Amino acid sequence: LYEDPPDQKTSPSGKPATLKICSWNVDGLRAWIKKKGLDWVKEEAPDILCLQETKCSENKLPAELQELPGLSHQYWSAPSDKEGYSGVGLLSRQAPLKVSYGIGDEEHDQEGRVIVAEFDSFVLVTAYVPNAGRGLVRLEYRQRWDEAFRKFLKGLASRKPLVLCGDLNVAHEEIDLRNPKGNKKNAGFTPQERQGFGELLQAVPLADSFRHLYPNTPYAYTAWTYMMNARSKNVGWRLDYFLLSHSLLPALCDSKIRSKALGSDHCPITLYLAL
DNA sequence: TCGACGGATCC
DNA sequence: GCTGATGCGC
DNA sequence: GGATCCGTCGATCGCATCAGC
Ligand SMILES: [Ca+2]
Ligand code: NA
Ligand code: NA
């Protein structure tokens, strides 16, 4: 079992956290709201909330989402021609300077996976990375995605400090899942997916916020299959990340795993920055 | 993720 | 709206 | 030749679609 440590809300130089970002693969936004997700969000009170795998077109967005005046600026992306699949959202207390959808590549911008929100001091990207598939049927596609995404993020980070959050659909290293041996040909732990993640960290470059602070902490996961009672056994994967520009590391206060928040087969993760 | 399967392969 | 089947996925 | 091993290999859970009416 795993117990996330208490929230560190001061920076390495003693500056108080001024910004709290929460990211959560809700795996069915309507179901997550029915499973009381927005109660949990309201007690966490983030300044920005990023959601993945909403599986909900904009028309079907439940009413409860306009009853949250702390996250009143809301942006949504859905697949162009495939309903109930993928989907992401970004809700913010303050309006961003600019919002865009996708990474600027037609091939990869059709499944509602990416929202980019530019603020004063940084750019925030939230992403739902495409799963490599059962039988690895989409691994070849995933490797092309990885190359296009890496390139996109490198470009962005060259202009403003970057924060990338969301479900990146890879457990980087053997410490990031419960059963590394049995999963090296399964989606999320292929050498191709792990190599892509490493290349992302090096080429942009980006740092893995949680591992920067807790480099040797095992059993810390963000996702558990619904089957086989995995979550109660903590047989999980760390698939949800906050990746940061190296320049933001002195602003980094903490990177949390909200293990006990139910409502999905992923738990939320939370980032504190002193900006 | 778990167990049932099968087909090496040591004692 | 309801049933039954298919898609997709830690 | 009875008992362990180790590469596959199906059925689980959950959400949302779709076809039909
Ligand atoms: Ca499928
Ligand atoms: Na390894
Ligand atoms: Na630096």
Side-chain angles (χ1 to χ4, degrees), chain A residues 1-66 68-80 82-275:
Chain A
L1 304 187
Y2 171 75
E3 182 140 341
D4 212 32
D7 294 9
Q8 168 64 267
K9 322 162 86 84
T10 65
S11 87
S13 58
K15 275 205 57 211
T18 57
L19 177 74
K20 177 170 187 173
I21 304 174
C22 176
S23 183
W24 197 354
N25 176 325
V26 304
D27 209 349
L29 167 72
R30 284 164 287 176
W32 169 80
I33 289 175
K34 285 193 242 278
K35 290 174 290 191
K36 293 179 179 179
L38 294 160
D39 290 346
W40 187 93
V41 166
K42 165 145 184 304
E43 292 161 9
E44 179 80 340
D47 299 294
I48 300 175
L49 170 74
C50 296
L51 307 173
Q52 303 87 36
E53 203 168 6
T54 55
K55 300 185 174 202
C56 187
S57 55
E58 191 155 331
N59 289 337
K60 326 265 172 90
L61 292 167
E64 299 85 320
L65 289 177
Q66 38 202 333
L68 295 174
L71 299 172
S72 75
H73 303 89
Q74 307 182 353
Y75 310 90
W76 304 97
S77 188
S80 62
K82 192 176 323 174
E83 185 130 342
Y85 172 69
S86 187
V88 297
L90 194 147
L91 305 78
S92 183
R93 185 177 43 84
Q94 296 178 189
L97 303 180
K98 182 179 163 68
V99 170
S100 47
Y101 301 104
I103 70 177
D105 189 325
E106 185 73 24
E107 189 193 327
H108 305 297
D109 291 347
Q110 303 311 306
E111 296 178 349
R113 294 183 177 280
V114 164
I115 295 174
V116 182
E118 166 165 10
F119 296 90
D120 278 341
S121 310
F122 68 107
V123 179
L124 174 64
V125 180
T126 197
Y128 174 50
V129 163
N131 201 280
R134 261 152 155 206
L136 299 194
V137 298
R138 215 137 110 103
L139 178 56
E140 152 178 316
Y141 172 67
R142 169 57 174 281
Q143 295 181 69
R144 302 173 42 79
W145 165 278
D146 277 1
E147 180 189 357
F149 197 34
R150 177 199 324 142
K151 266 183 80 280
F152 170 70
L153 293 176
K154 187 180 179 195
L156 252 182
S158 79
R159 305 195 281 278
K160 227 172 211 184
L162 166 71
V163 175
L164 174 68
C165 71
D167 177 351
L168 304 187
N169 256 321
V170 52
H172 183 203
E173 294 295 348
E174 303 193 7
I175 194 177
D176 292 313
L177 69 177
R178 181 61 174 274
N179 304 322
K181 322 301 179 209
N183 277 302
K184 298 187 142 120
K185 315 165 139 181
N186 287 336
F189 204 60
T190 64
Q192 295 94 319
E193 293 169 284
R194 296 172 63 197
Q195 283 149 14
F197 191 85
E199 279 142 24
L200 180 69
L201 293 188
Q202 199 268 343
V204 181
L206 295 167
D208 180 339
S209 63
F210 175 86
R211 210 46 94 183
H212 170 74
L213 300 174
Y214 307 106
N216 303 113
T217 296
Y219 309 122
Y221 311 128
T222 70
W224 311 258
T225 181
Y226 283 125
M227 276 141 303
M228 297 336 280
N229 286 112
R231 184 157 184 180
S232 69
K233 316 173 187 171
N234 197 23
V235 181
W237 305 53
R238 194 170 66 102
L239 305 174
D240 303 274
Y241 300 76
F242 286 105
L243 309 192
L244 312 184
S245 289
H246 283 50
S247 56
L248 289 173
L249 289 183
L252 174 58
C253 292
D254 207 345
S255 176
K256 317 306 292 169
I257 299 178
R258 306 302 205 197
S259 307
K260 299 195 280 220
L262 309 167
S264 171
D265 47 357
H266 297 242
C267 73
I269 55 172
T270 290
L271 188 75
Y272 289 94
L273 297 177
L275 282 167

